[PDB]
From a paper:
The 70-kDa heat shock proteins (Hsp70) are chaperones with central roles in processes that involve polypeptide remodeling events. Hsp70 proteins consist of two major functional domains: an N-terminal nucleotide binding domain (NBD) with ATPase activity, and a C-terminal substrate binding domain (SBD). Hsp70 proteins bind and release client polypeptides in a cycle that is coupled to an ATPase activity. We present the first crystal structures of four human Hsp70 isoforms, those of the NBDs of HSPA1L, HSPA2, HSPA5 and HSPA6.
Heat shock 70-like protein-1 (HSPA1L, also called Hsp70-hom or Hsp70t) is a constitutively expressed, non-inducible cytosolic protein with high abundance in testis. Polymorphisms in the HSPA1L gene, predominantly in the region coding for the client binding domain, have been linked to disease. We determined the structures of the ATPase domains of HSPA1L, HSPA2, HSPA5, and HSPA6. In all ATPase domains except for that of HSPA5/BiP the products of ATP hydrolysis, including inorganic phosphate, were observed. We conclude that at least HSPA1A, HSPA1L, and HSPA2 bound ATP in the expression host, hydrolyzed their bound ATP, and subsequently during crystallization never released the products of ATP hydrolysis into solution. The overall structures of the four human Hsp70 ATPase domains that were determined here for the first time all closely resemble the structure of HSPA1A and related previously determined structures.
Residue numbers in the entry: 6 to 189, 193 to 384
The structure:
């Protein structure tokens, strides 16, 4: 009677199981507790997760990501049409629906967004099966609070394609609240979720175990990727200065620099400096340099400070003052950035923020708790 909880994320996904009184977040084969929502196709194999993201600079047309931006939408949806312009892979109109078109084992192959997502789900499921030592056929899968019926259905369909019985589709902010036991009078909770691609602020009221979404706010195109890109621009300028060379138009160079920037960014959450070392970045030139946390914070200052406007807006929409919020929960990997935590804490006049659960694991953690409840 064992079910898993799955955060099927725009940029990173995560799988947990509640067993013998506690949640285990299941690490992938590289030891990472979260997995990139990436699928890549080569002349010989299909790569999912870390191995797919790792080779993105060498196989841009056939490395698919951001399927969550397509899932449950029609090809003619203006959101899809806008997003298509930003991706290196092809999206085609098949019977009114978007399909990503790739080259795989020497043939053209097209996949629905829910098929791409099913591949990510299948990998997560299989990792859980290896961990537990038996099949897993039940799961709770999470979605953004703003998802419509079509998007929820397509996500549930991804689960069925992956061989799961989907016990429930639950909202991400609700899962995060469940992770912290906030459902166990009225309790008002604010979820601040700054991820890899999206920023969501949710206000929930919880009364006798029942959740009501009181307000949602945010930006569907603000996240960690934007911070990586501020670092990229910075280092593009440093390369123009040290070498009189604009690497800006070499797509591979920019991609490899972005990968290095993401790694450096992560390091800056626990250290005040980070080294970048890119062998042969551009014309056999090694690029060895460094970046301080404080410089990184400056480079992103407008974006970090801008996260407080959706907090204000959500509060206004929920007709609540700051002070009336019982609990604030940090979700999303970008909330590990010290400056983001300071900004939010200062906004809330110094109070404690719920962050003891790794913020990039909290959604899966809550999903895992709820999956076990549903099986009981
Ligand atoms: N220690 C860290 N410091 C800063 N950013 C991080 C850290 N760990 C992960 N990230 C970033 O978190 C983002 C992913 O957030 P996550 O919540 O895991 O996924 P999603 O938003 O797709 O659900 C990525 O931009 C990643 O680089
Ligand atoms: Mn997320």
């Amino acid at each position: 009677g064992i079910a898993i909880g799955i955060d099927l994320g725009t940029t990173y996904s995560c799988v947990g199981v509640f067993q013998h009184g506690k949640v285990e977040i299941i690490a992938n084969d590289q030891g990472n507790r979260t997995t990139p929502s990436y699928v890549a196709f080569t002349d010989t194999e299909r790569l999912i997760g870390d191995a797919a993201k790792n080779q993105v600079a060498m196989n841009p047309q056939n490395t698919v990501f951001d399927a969550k931006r397509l899932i449950g939408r029609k090809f003619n949806d203006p959101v899809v049409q806008a997003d298509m312009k930003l991706w290196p892979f092809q999206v085609i109109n098949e019977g009114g629906k978007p399909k990503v078109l790739v080259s795989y084992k020497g043939e053209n192959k097209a996949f629905y967004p829910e098929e791409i997502s099913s591949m990510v789900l299948t990998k997560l499921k299989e990792t859980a099966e290896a961990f537990l030592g038996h099949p897993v056929t039940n799961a709770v899968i999470t979605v953004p609070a703003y998802f419509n019926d079509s998007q929820r259905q397509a996500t549930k369909d991804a689960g069925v394609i992956a061989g799961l019985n989907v016990l429930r589709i639950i909202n991400e902010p609700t899962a995060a609240a469940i992770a912290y036991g906030l459902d166990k009078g009225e309790r008002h909770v604010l979820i601040f979720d700054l991820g890899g691609g999206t920023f969501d602020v949710s206000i929930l009221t919880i009364d006798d175990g029942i959740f009501e979404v009181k307000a949602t706010a945010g930006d569907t195109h603000l996240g960690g990727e934007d911070f990586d890109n501020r670092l990229v621009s910075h280092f593009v300028e440093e390369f123009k200065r040290k070498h009189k060379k604009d690497i800006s138009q070499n797509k591979r160079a920019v991609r490899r620099l972005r990968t290095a920037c993401e790694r450096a960014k992560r390091t800056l959450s626990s250290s005040t400096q980070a080294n970048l070392e890119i062998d042969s970045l551009y014309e056999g030139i090694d690029f060895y340099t460094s970046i301080t946390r404080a410089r990184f914070e400056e480079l992103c200052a407008d974006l970090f400070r801008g996260t407080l406007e959706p907090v204000e807006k959500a509060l206004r929409d929920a007709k609540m003052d700051k002070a009336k919020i019982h609990d604030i929960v940090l979700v999303g990997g970008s909330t590990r950035i010290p400056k983001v935590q300071r900004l939010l804490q200062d906004y809330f006049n110094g109070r404690d923020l719920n962050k003891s659960i790794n913020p990039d694991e909290a959604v899966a953690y809550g999903a895992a708790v709820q999956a076990a409840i549903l099986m009981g």
